[PDB]
Enzyme design. Structure first.
Site, PDB file in Angstrom:
ATOM      1  N   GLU A 118      25.927  49.883  78.678  1.00 39.65           N
ATOM      2  CA  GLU A 118      25.985  48.495  78.233  1.00 39.65           C
ATOM      3  C   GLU A 118      26.029  47.539  79.418  1.00 39.65           C
ATOM      4  O   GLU A 118      25.438  46.454  79.373  1.00 39.65           O
ATOM      5  CB  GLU A 118      27.202  48.285  77.334  1.00 39.65           C
ATOM      6  N   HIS A 119      26.724  47.926  80.488  1.00 48.07           N
ATOM      7  CA  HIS A 119      26.854  47.052  81.648  1.00 48.07           C
ATOM      8  C   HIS A 119      25.502  46.775  82.291  1.00 48.07           C
ATOM      9  O   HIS A 119      25.199  45.635  82.658  1.00 48.07           O
ATOM     10  CB  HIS A 119      27.819  47.672  82.656  1.00 48.07           C
TER      11      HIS A 119
ATOM     12  N   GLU B 238      36.407  45.681  87.018  1.00 49.12           N
ATOM     13  CA  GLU B 238      36.692  45.297  85.641  1.00 49.12           C
ATOM     14  C   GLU B 238      37.898  46.047  85.103  1.00 49.12           C
ATOM     15  O   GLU B 238      38.692  45.485  84.350  1.00 49.12           O
ATOM     16  CB  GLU B 238      35.476  45.542  84.745  1.00 49.12           C
TER      17      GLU B 238
END
Ligand code: HEM
Lengths: 51, 435, 55, 418, 54, 101, 39, 47, 55
Positions: free
Chosen positions: B59-60, B136
């Protein structure tokens, strides 16, 4: 005590009446067992063997 | 028009299926804008300990470049249209959606296809995203609610895939290579496990033919809930976060409807609420009056075959106990003595939540995609209202007794949680001697 | 609202003495005897009293 | 159908749209806010916003709270610098009930000493929650620095005024600003005659055109806050055009030329000119966008940058240099067209939601006194020329600067140094 | 003070034997005790409340 | 009604709280509603009530009485607490009626 | 348009949640969107 | 650093009914609670 | 340093019960009897005990 004279408290009672009845039976059975009433224990099939 | 008439006039969701299994769903509403997205039935719970971060990693770097739009070009194209491209991935679903003018429906769909199928994972881009994801994680630590909910998931579903966090361990992030990400995408990003949803100005035939144009070239473990606790004692933190849950039902279980009502009865509170001591929820009123809680909220997080049903609150060092007490007491009330008026209020709250959450093209698209992934169908608001109307006090009492009364909970504490009652005391609080 | 156990005076005393008293988690069986002493005392008070009804 | 816009004889403006949605949403927008406070009643608007559930002439606080929560409705107050919007949203059947509550909150408030005194601490709690994110503090300092009065007042009560907002000040504020000509009643899912009837029943006692504040005077000062945070937030702006003018459209197009916000999650903001200009020389975590505030009498346009403490000056100067380069004429027609597309899409997405549509209609009714279809808004947007954007950039570059900074500072420049 | 005098009367009669005047005076005294504590005092308090306008 | 006024004045004189300088609302039993009403009183009224009660307690400590001309006159007795108590009781009644439903 | 909602970021900067009373405030576009990309 | 922690293996202490992680515990909850409360009930009867 | 009468546990109880107890200033002689009762009780014990040594 008109504070408790409402529909909700009527519903509240009906929700707790079965529970209160069950606890009453526990008290009744407990009292008969503890005191050996024998007015009631004569009816009980196996307990009536005693006395 | 009345509420029922308004419900019956809600436009229906049209669903079709491609020949490869892709489900194309749309809700036209005659608006200049429209949302179009892809919801994939892939997430953390489909990953093992070797690749626990594959989904979040993919997804990143989904938007960082494709085989047809290398590097930043893709982004520029989206930005050229004024469209907003967003994505997320939970423990069970992944989603990539675009908000754009309905006139830009084709291109957007094309982009989505390129994002889903022809994703190019450049090694330099992979390393950049690896560093980004590590930072993150170090930032995610700061977010107390996310940490406490991850702890709740880890302890409740220990030994099962659901215990794994979405992001995955930092070691797993460092180990993940291009081969692992490619294998994860090939296994999970498959047509039968994806839904192309759209809402707004879209027309179902247009969306369906666009999907057939772009998405045709596409490939053709019940978790165990465990009553436990994780206590991360850290007295340096200003406030203590607690999240206590019990085993809930699945998505398809009807009992989700009354249970939400039950939660609506418990309600939510925050120190910034203006309701104060007059809040209908007795727990909210007590929290406002006694200053017991900065913010508490009940949650019903459902999964395919299980779920977490409970509450999360933030409290001072010396208040946790009291709050827990009241919270548990509330549950017990619903299990034993739930009245009709509060159930009606909870039903109204649930109806309002259902109708309000579906305001906007993006919420409607999210609802369509998630419903197709979980329920396999879009539940109309009329059916939701019928299910809610079926709920009464007796149903609430029965369902709460089934799921709450005398059940082993999963508890997650974080911060100055010295006053958090011992698990034996909490378990004892999960039942009433009077009842 | 409050908790009767943690608010009522007698209940406050009892709760802070025998219900919510922080106790070490590792005290062995040698820490039982204290309570045993109390038990013994109560017994000696009860039993002895019934001996005083006939002595 | 379409929007039923109407102006009442007293000046009240009622607009109703029947979209046949199951939910009904009614808002009352009042031309009252921090702008309409003076030095002696600072913070009154804040407490008024927090006091939407106090006892009123029609209903008590308990009655209001329990009645709104029983039907599951929600009553919220959104207070901007020059407007205050109450809004009740619930189901279509129950809306009438909430309507009464709404018009009891605004038309007939009753501030009782004990209730207000209890509410006082909520001011501190709410301000702390708001200031948890540095953007709020930086913006309050920016508005204090930019303007001498009116718009200078912050959205939140000053610390020294937390326990000193008397009920009399609240009554005075309501009486002098909650008037018919300063109000607008907008409804979604509500029939027009019902809204007119409720407006006549309640929003008629107070004569229109209440107390009017002074025009905001631009100050062009500076407010630097040293709070030691790792990240420095800086806002450097200059007086732009007021809302509703063509130059305001030019400034908005300029903002979307420079880049208002990201369009791709975790994207590099390639089309954002400011972001690319800063990135060329700064390799640390940073963020830069174009700040654009449009108000009735004035406006602010500038750059907002979050940067490292030791690199704040570099980021600020790079963003300013990019704006200056745009001012000199280095602006492509393609970039202007892309910014117009972004602006149109953003406006349509904003009005797409029920909350967005309600606030948009309320703002239009409160500013222009009339409703404008989104087609006309789009036509106005595309009517902007590249020359207009260049002129707006020139005005920013060649105008008095006001800056607000918050962070470790030390390497953050001053307004003169820019 | 009527109640206190009544209690004194009850004590005096409890001292005295069970004969003609003592029986009837004791019955009346017991009735008066229960009446004063149960009936007369709340009614008199309500009358005083009405006399004080609250 | 004139006879009613006369008997009310006679009872007010008989109830000797005026002899202590007190007012009628000073003698009220402080239950929850009265406590809330006192907490809602404006500062000047609360201070006056506190001083009057303290002076009455001081007088009763010495078994003495206020001078004849300082007794609270029946016609100038102010029911300062009555409105606040009425509002508090009304609010309590409303909450109880809501609970009944 | 005549609202302070100029860009998705900035307006509704500090809006607190609530039910039956939930005040909110709206400033102007204040960035911080996409800032979370790096620590 | 909250994601790299995992609950240690309690399989050495779990009851035989809840040893498998791919099997739901809702079925065995009644049996386990019944066993514990039967022990408690027999204790109470003797007392 | 501290004051023993205010800090020591038994001294705390005794001080809060009989020494620093806030008492109304206008209570009449009718409030003595309570304490009198206690005295009677103590007497009825002491005297009573010295009757049990021979009864
Ligand atoms: C710590 C408390 C007590 C201790 C250690 C204690 C100990 C004893 C002992 C060792 C005896 C001798 C028994 C024998 O030789 O057969 C005795 C007898 C007796 N005790 Fe206790 N006692 C206690 C409390 C009491 C109390 C509270 C009472 C009365 C209320 C009581 C009443 C009696 C009587 C009447 C006897 C004589 C009856 C007999 O010897 O069988 N005792 N006690």
């Amino acid at each position: 005590l008109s504070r408790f004279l409402g529909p909700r408290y009527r519903e509240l009672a009906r929700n707790w009446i079965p529970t209160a009845s069950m606890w009453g039976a526990v008290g009744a059975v407990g009292l008969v067992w503890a005191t050996d009433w024998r007015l009631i224990l004569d009816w009980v099939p196996y307990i009536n063997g005693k006395f | 028009a009345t509420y029922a008439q308004a419900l019956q006039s809600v436009p229906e969701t049209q669903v079709s299926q491609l020949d490869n299994g892709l489900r194309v769903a749309s809700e036209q509403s005659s608006q200049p804008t429209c949302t179009v997205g892809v919801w994939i039935d892939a997430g953390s719970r489909y990953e093992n300990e070797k690749n626990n971060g594959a989904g979040y990693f993919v997804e990143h770097l989904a938007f960082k470049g494709t085989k047809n739009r290398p590097g930043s070009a893709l982004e520029k194209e989206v930005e050229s249209m004024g469209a907003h491209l967003n994505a997320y991935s939970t423990r069970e679903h992944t989603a990539y959606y675009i908000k754009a003018l309905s006139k830009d429906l084709p291109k957007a769909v094309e982009l989505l296809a390129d994002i889903v199928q022809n994703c190019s994972l450049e090694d330099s881009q992979i390393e950049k995203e690896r560093d980004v994801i590590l930072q993150e994680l170090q930032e995610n630590d700061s977010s107390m609610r996310d940490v406490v909910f991850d702890y709740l998931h880890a302890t409740a579903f220990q030994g099962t895939p659901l215990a794994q966090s979405v992001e995955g361990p930092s070691e797993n992030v460092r180990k993940l290579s291009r081969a692992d990400l490619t294998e994860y995408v090939s296994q999970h990003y498959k047509a039968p496990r994806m839904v192309l949803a759209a809402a707004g100005g879209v027309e179902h035939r247009q969306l369906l033919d666009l999907a057939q144009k772009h998405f045709s070239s596409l490939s053709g473990t019940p978790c165990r809930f465990t009553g436990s606790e994780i206590r991360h004692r850290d007295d340096a933190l200003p406030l203590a976060h607690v999240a206590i849950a019990v085993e809930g039902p699945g998505w398809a279980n009807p009992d989700n409807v009354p249970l939400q009502v039950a939660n609506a009865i418990i309600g939510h509170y925050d120190s910034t609420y203006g309701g104060g001591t007059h809040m209908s929820s007795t727990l909210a009123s007590v929290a406002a009056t006694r200053k017991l809680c900065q913010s508490f909220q009940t949650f019903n997080i459902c999964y395919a075959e299980t779920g977490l049903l409970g509450a999360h609150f933030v409290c001072d060092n010396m208040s946790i106990d009291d709050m827990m007490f009241f919270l548990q007491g509330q549950w017990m009330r619903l299990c034993t003595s739930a009245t009709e008026s509060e159930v009606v209020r909870g039903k109204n709250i649930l109806r309002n939540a259902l109708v309000s959450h579906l305001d906007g093209t993006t919420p409607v698209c999210e609802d369509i995609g998630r419903s197709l992934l979980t329920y396999g169908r879009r539940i109309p608001l009329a059916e939701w209202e019928s299910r809610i109307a079926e709920v009464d006090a007796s149903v609430v009492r029965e369902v709460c007794s089934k799921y709450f009364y005398d059940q082993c909970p999963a508890v997650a504490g974080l911060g100055p949680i010295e006053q958090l009652p011992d698990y034996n005391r909490i378990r004892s609080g999960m039942f009433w001697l009077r009842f | 609202m409050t908790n009767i156990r943690k608010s009522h005076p007698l209940m406050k005393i009892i709760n802070n003495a025998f219900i919510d008293l922080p106790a070490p988690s590792n005290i062995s069986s040698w820490w039982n005897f204290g309570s045993l002493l109390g038990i013994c005392l109560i017994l000696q008070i009860l039993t002895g009293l019934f001996l005083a009804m006939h002595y | 159908q379409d929007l039923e816009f109407t102006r009442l004889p007293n000046g009240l403006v009622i607009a109703s749209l029947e979209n046949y949605a199951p939910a009904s949403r009614i808002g009352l927008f009042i031309k009252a806010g921090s702008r309409y406070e003076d030095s002696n009643n600072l913070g009154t608007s804040h407490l008024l916003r927090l006091a939407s559930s106090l006892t009123t002439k029609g209903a008590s606080s308990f009655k209001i709270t329990r009645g709104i929560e029983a039907v599951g409705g929600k009553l919220s107050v959104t207070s901007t610098r020059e407007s205050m919007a109450y809004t009740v949203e619930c189901l279509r059947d129950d809306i009438e009930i909430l309507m009464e509550f709404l018009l009891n909150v605004t038309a007939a408030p009753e501030f009782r000493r004990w209730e207000v005194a209890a509410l006082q601490s909520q001011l501190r709690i709410d301000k702390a929650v708001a200031f948890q994110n540095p953007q709020a503090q930086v913006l309050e300092n920016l508005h204090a620095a930019a303007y001498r009065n009116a718009l200078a007042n912050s959205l939140y009560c000053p610390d020294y005024r937390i326990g000193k907002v008397t009920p009399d000040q609240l009554h005075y504020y309501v009486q002098n600003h909650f008037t018919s000509a300063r109000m607008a009643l907008i409804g979604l899912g509500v029939s027009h005659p019902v809204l007119k009837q409720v407006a006549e029943r309640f929003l008629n006692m107070r004569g229109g055109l209440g107390l009017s504040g002074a025009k905001a005077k631009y100050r062009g000062g500076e407010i630097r806050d040293q709070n030691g945070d790792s990240l420095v937030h800086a806002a450097l702006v200059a007086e732009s055009a007021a809302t509703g003018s063509a130059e305001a459209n030019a400034f908005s197009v300029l903002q979307h030329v420079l880049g208002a916000g990201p369009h791709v999650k975790r994207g590099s903001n390639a089309t954002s000119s400011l972001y690319q200009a800063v990135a060329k020389g700064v390799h640390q975590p940073f963020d830069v966008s174009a700040f654009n505030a449009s108000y009735s009498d004035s406006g602010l346009f500038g750059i907002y940058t979050i940067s490292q403490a030791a690199s704040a000056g570099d980021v600020i100067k790079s963003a300013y240099d990019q704006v200056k380069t745009i001012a000199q004429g280095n602006l492509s027609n393609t970039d202007v067209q892309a910014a117009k597309n972004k602006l149109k899409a953003g406006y349509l997405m904003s009005v797409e939601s029920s909350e967005g549509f309600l606030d948009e209609v309320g703002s239009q009714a409160l500013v222009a006194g009339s409703y404008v279809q989104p087609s006309t808004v789009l036509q106005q947007i595309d009517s902007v020329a590249d020359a207009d954007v260049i002129n707006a950039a020139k005005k920013f570059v060649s105008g008095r600067k006001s800056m607000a900074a918050s962070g470790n500072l030390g390497h953050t420049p001053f307004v003169d140094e820019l | 003070w009527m109640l206190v005098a009544d209690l004194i009367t009850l004590t005096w009669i409890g001292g005295q034997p069970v004969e003609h005047p003592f029986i009837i005076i004791g019955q009346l005294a017991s009735i008066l005790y229960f009446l004063i504590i149960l009936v007369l005092m709340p009614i008199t308090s309500i009358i005083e409340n009405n006399l004080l306008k609250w | 009604s004139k006879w009613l006024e006369g008997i009310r004045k006679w009872y007010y004189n008989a109830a000797g709280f005026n002899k202590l300088g007190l007012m009628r609302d000073d003698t009220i039993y402080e239950d929850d509603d009265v406590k809330e009403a006192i907490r809602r009183l404006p500062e000047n009224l609360y201070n006056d009530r506190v001083f009057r009660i303290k002076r009455a307690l001081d007088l009763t400590m010495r078994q003495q009485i206020l001078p004849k001309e300082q007794w609270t006159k029946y016609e100038e007795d102010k029911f300062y607490l009555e409105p606040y108590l009425k509002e508090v009781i009304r609010e309590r009644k409303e909450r109880e009626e809501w609970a009944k439903k | 348009r005549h609202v302070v909602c100029r860009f998705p970021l900035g307006p509704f900067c500090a809006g607190v949640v609530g039910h039956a009373a939930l005040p909110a405030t709206s400033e102007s576009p204040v960035l911080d969107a996409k800032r979370s990309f790096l620590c | 650093s909250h994601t790299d922690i995992r609950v240690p293996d309690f399989s050495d202490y779990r009851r035989a009914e809840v040893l498998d992680s791919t099997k739901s515990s809702k079925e065995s909850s009644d049996a386990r609670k019944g066993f514990s409360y039967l022990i408690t009930a027999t204790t109470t009867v003797g007392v």
